[PDB]
């Protein structure tokens, strides 16, 4: 009932993990719409490198396309195909 | 090759998800040690409620105990059993 140092280290270390990302972050120049859902699950670089002079950055990336409700409030609503960035390989760099 | 509105909505919605949490956040009063790994995978409340006057907060919580390397720098190192908070049920509240 205690997680062992090498499991932890292994699970925590820099990798692509499923991460919930606010859409407003990905599209910060959106004056026009609110979004539903407001956040989307994307594979993103998460974890630690365990070395202050390193950071976990993606190497290889691929676009994924999703159906998002775009509400122009008090005006209307529709469903829009939205492209989001995904990370396929992460690795520790300076 | 396009994620369908109801999948997205379903996957994005408020739930316990595996999240990498910096240890320094959980123990912000730590003057003495650096930690290895510096971040740990914990089940935490993530997602959206899709309703500006709501937020995704945990209901039921449980402590998990992990083995972390604690380095007092230029002094020494050891392995320490560290308790971290985990969320078992999340739900949307005001």
């Amino acid at each position, epitope marked *: 009932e205690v997680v062992k140092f090498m499991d932890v280290y292994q699970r925590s270390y820099c990798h692509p993990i499923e991460t919930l990302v606010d859409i407003f972050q990905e599209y910060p120049d959106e004056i026009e719409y*609110i979004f*539903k*859902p407001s956040c989307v699950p994307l594979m993103r670089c998460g974890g630690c490198c365990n070395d202050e002079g390193l950071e976990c950055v993606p190497t290889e990336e691929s676009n994924i396309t999703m*159906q998002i*409700m775009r*509400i*122009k*409030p*008090h*005006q*209307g*609503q*529709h*469903i*829009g*195909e939205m492209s989001f960035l995904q990370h396929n390989k992460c690795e520790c760099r300076p | 090759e396009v994620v369908k*509105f109801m999948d997205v*909505y379903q996957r994005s919605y408020c739930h316990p998800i595996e999240t990498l949490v910096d240890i320094f956040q959980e123990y912000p009063d730590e003057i003495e040690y650096i930690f290895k790994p510096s971040c740990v995978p914990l089940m935490r409340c993530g997602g959206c*409620c*899709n*309703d*500006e*006057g*709501l937020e995704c907060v945990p209901t039921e919580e449980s402590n998990i105990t992990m083995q972390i390397m604690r380095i007092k720098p230029h002094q020494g190192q050891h392995i320490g059993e560290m308790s971290f908070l985990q969320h078992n049920k999340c739900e949307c509240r005001p």
Partner: antibody, heavy 123, light 112 residues
Framework: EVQLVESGGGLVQPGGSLRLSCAAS????????IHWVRQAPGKGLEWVAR????????RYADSVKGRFTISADTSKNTAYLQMNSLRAEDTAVYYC????????????????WGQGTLVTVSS | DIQMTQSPSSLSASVGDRVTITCRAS??????????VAWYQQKPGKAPKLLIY???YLYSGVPSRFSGSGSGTDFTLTISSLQPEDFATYYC?????????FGQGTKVEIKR
């Protein structure tokens, strides 16, 4: 048990005025858009007006702007349409309808309709 | 302001037939955009009832023989096996913008 019950239709003269009511029940009109939609005899459906009761925001079709006013009294759970300067082309069945809430935001379709009230603009 | 053009204007079909009715938006909307059309059924001297919302979702209590789809400017309501009680006028409605507008209707007669 959602219901919308329109009243106050009837005969009215050209240039006259009429106020329609819509009594809602099984829900709070606070949480929804209320609309009026009309249908001239034997014709299609024409949206006339919309109210967001909390803040009292209104929108209108051009054919009725400046003559019709939509409102809502949240304490009586009742929506109104005040109709002024009526002409024969305003003759129609007038329906109240709601757009419920989904994903914490009003929908822009009409999920419940009352049964309508006939307005006849004639001398 | 979107005008919606509905076709056909009227049709005659037999019980069990598949019926298809279309709605075209007047404005140039591309195929990546969908879910802005609702469809209603109106029987004579009755209020319309909602059948399909957000382009293609079936409204609760509506029989499953009704369905819808579409994208861009082009939407479709299908009745997969026409019943005698499906005698009606059917209307589409856009809510891409305000004012929301209606097509002008398709009158379905049951051929017997």
């Amino acid at each position: 048990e959602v219901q919308l019950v329109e009243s106050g239709g009837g005969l009215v003269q050209p240039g006259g005025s009429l106020r329609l009511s819509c009594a809602a029940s099984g829900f709070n009109i606070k949480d929804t858009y209320i609309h009026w939609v009309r249908q001239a005899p034997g014709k299609g459906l024409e949206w006339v007006a919309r109210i967001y009761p909390t803040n009292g925001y209104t929108r209108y079709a051009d054919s009725v702007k400046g003559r019709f006013t939509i409102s809502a009294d949240t304490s009586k759970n009742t929506a109104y349409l005040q109709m002024n300067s009526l002409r024969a082309e305003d003759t129609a069945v007038y329906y109240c309808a709601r757009g419920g809430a989904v994903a914490g935001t009003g929908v822009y379709y009409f999920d419940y309709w009352g049964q309508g009230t006939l307005v006849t603009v004639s001398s | 302001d979107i005008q919606m053009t509905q076709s056909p204007s009227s049709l005659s079909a037999s019980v069990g037939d598949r019926v298809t009715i279309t709605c075209r938006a007047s404005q140039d909307i591309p195929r990546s955009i969908s879910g802005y059309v609702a469809w209603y059924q109106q029987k004579p001297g009755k209020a319309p009832k909602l059948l399909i919302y957000w382009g293609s979702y079936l409204y609760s209590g509506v029989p499953s023989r009704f369905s819808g789809s579409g994208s861009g400017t082009d939407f479709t309501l299908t009745i997969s096996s026409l019943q005698p009680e499906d005698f009606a006028t059917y209307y589409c409605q856009q809510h891409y913008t305000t004012p929301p507008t209606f097509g002008q209707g398709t009158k379905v007669e049951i051929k017997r």
